[PDB]
Each structure stands twice: as structure tokens, then as C-alpha cells.
Amino acid sequence: VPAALKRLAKYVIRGFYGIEHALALDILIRNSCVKEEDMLELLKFDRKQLRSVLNNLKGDKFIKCRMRVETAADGKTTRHNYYFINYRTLVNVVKYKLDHMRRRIETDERDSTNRASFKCPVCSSTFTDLEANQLFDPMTGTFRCTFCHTEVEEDESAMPKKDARTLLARFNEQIEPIYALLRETED
């Protein structure tokens, strides 16, 4: 278990998950495999609370579980859930969750062009620029709304467009440590 893998997992869990998820990860870092029951006692979390976090971790496939069945000393059947970290599968999910944001960022660039600027104040409905000329009434000489017969404005749609632009630069900066860690874990 290279130290790079351990650090990479820690850096991502504390950034996009609550303290509950991070604490459970530390147990799996100290020991390669730990029983679900043992983890419950150490963390003192609720039975459902621990399962919910584990399900979320299992949902993102950051850790895998294997079931071992054995006969107890008293003869009753025992079903212990053993959890362990799968770095090979974990790294793919981190890349998947990062590329989608990058492609989402790329999508945000195209969304800005197709945003609907025209909107009627009465019915509070926004219409596309191409659709604006459809409602254009030659007699009035200005944009109008057929449902409301009211003037259509376009100044209110300009403000929210600039907000998305600021998120692009900031997203790339805060994500550099994750990208740098990924390059170190390619071996």
C-alpha cells in the first residue's frame, strides 16, 4: 500500500464528505481489513448511522465488503461483514467524479450561449431569443407576450450569466491538489 494511495483517499474524503465518512476511513487505513462490528464499537456510531455511511461508501465503491460465515462456539450461525479498501476501484471513481465536473464545466460554457433572455413579467415565463421574434407584434413595433399582451424585457437575464464564469477559475484552482495526487498514484 503506497503512501500516495493513502494520502489521496484521505484528501478526497474530507473535501466532499462529512466527518463520519472520514473517521471510518482512518480505521481501514491503520488496518487492511476491519470487521463492521468492530468499527461500530470504536466509533460508537448508531447501527443505522454506520450502515448509512458504509452504504454511501459502498455506493461510491471506495471500499468493498466480503461476507464470511462460520459456526460460533455456542453453535449459532455468525454472519460477519468484513470491509476493506479497493484502491484500484477507488481511483477510477475519483477520476469519474472529477471528469464529469470538468465536462460539466465544459457544458456550462455552451449553456451560457443558449440561455433564454426574453421574459414576460406578467406570466414570469422566459423565452429564447429565436422565440422572441415569433411573438414580435408588428403593430406595436416591440416584443410582447401573447398570453399577457404585455411588453417583454431582457435585462433581468444578464446578471446571472456572469456568476457562472467566476466558478470556472476557482474550480480549477481548488482542484489542483487532487490532480497532483492522481499523477503520483499512476504507478
Next chain:
Amino acid sequence: MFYHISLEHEILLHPRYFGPNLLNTVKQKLFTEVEGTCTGKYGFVIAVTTIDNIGAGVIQPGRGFVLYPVKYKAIVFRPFKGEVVDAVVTQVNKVGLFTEIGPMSCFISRHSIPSEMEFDPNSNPPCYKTMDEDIVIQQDDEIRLKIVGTRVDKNDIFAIGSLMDDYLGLV
């Protein structure tokens, strides 16, 4: 672009029009219905060059009308996106410029107009002119515009003209 195509139309002939000259009425009724009407698939129809054939008139059960499918050759013009076509300006306004291309009418938004162009309210005839007056666009002039998009509504089609692309506008 002007295209000579064959179109399928159906004529419902009232029983009063039966008897001698039935086919003449079907042919005559074809011109009235097709002419002056436009559809998105084929666009505006100018006139019927000829009638290829009149199909068998199928009596409509109960209705009493006879449905006559007609194959007729007519010339139509349809605006194609990303195409340059000569246009004639009808009216000039600050909001936008209105141009007519045959039966089709195109509207040019102020945004699509080049930035250097500015509305000339002071002049009696509204027009768009540059600071140096190198190019002037006014009413009733032959200009070239690019069909950004085609929209059809209420059997009417009107497109958007953009002069941003080079080799456009008055020449």
C-alpha cells in the same frame, strides 16, 4: 432556393360540381387551394406549373364528397439555414430591419446587424449608415443576408438575416 417539385394534394369536390366539366373544376379548384398557402415541409408555393395526373375520385361514404388526389408540379422557395440569398429591404427600424424575398419575409434583429452600423433617426428615410458612410443600407435596396434559422407558424415562414459573415450586405 427555387425548386420545381411535384406535390400531392387532395381535393374534396362537392356533388354540385359533378357532371360535365368535373375534371376542369378539380383542376381549377386545385389552383385556388394550393396558391396563397404555405407549409413548413415545402414552404411557400408560387403557382402550379402543370397537373401531372388526377387520381380516381374516391366517394367518401356518408359525406357525399369525392376525394380527388392530384399530382401537380409547382415551384416553391424554402429558406435554408446557413445560406446566403439576396433580399430587398421593405422597412427600416431601430429594433430591426424587415426584408422581403418573394413571398417569404425575413426580419433582421439589431444584434445580428454589424456593430458599426447605427440607426439614422435624424434622416427622413430611416436607414443604417457607418461613420465613414462607406456602406449605407436603406429601404428598397438589394442586400445579401445569411439565413440563420427557419421558423414556421400559422402556415407562414420567416427567417433571420445576419450580416456578420463577409461578402454580405449591400454590394
Next chain:
Amino acid sequence: EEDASQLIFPKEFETAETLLNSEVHMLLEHRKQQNESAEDEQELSEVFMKTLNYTARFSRFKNRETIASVRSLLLQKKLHKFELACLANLCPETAEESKALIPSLEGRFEDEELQQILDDIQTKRSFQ
């Protein structure tokens, strides 16, 4: 789905024949001639007048023989039917101008040969 520049047209606009404005004017004029005959018949719609003026205004050839000669020469050259209408309608003065208007025209023929084709149309064209 359909772009004139990309030479992509729907199934309907595949076998359709393209007629020049001068050619279109002749057909419309024939309709006008028939309009005078058979008095009391339906009067031609206003749309007909609009197109007739438009085609006449842009008519690049006022002689029927010249129109046929231009078409015959164009038939020899392996040119698309849609592109032929644009070539004989716009009548670009220079080969470069023709290429810019129609991006698909690039590579169809040599630049030197392309200019010669345009020059031939000018000779047939009648200036008034």
C-alpha cells in the same frame, strides 16, 4: 438536418430540378400569357406577382437562346444541380469569391479552371 453549404438535403429535395431565375421567369411569363387567355378565369394570386418581379429583377439572361446555351455548357461540367443554380444566379466575378460563398465548391475543380468557368458566364451575360 439540411444545410445548403454541406450539400445535405432531405429525401424530397433529391430528384428536384433547380431552375434559374431567368428560366423561372420564362415559366412565370407563360403563366401570365395563359392568364390573359380564357377570360373570366381566376386572377393570379399576389404571391405570383411578387416572385415574377423578383426573378425579372435578378434575370441574368434576357435571351432564351443564351439561357439554353449556358445550361448546355454547364451540363458538360460535372457540377451538382443545386450548385449550378447558385453558380448561374450569384454569378461571382472571381473564382475566390465563388469558393468563399460555397465552401463545398472547394476541391471540385482546379482554381485556374474555376475562374475560366465564371468568365464564360460573363461573356454570355448581357449588360444593359
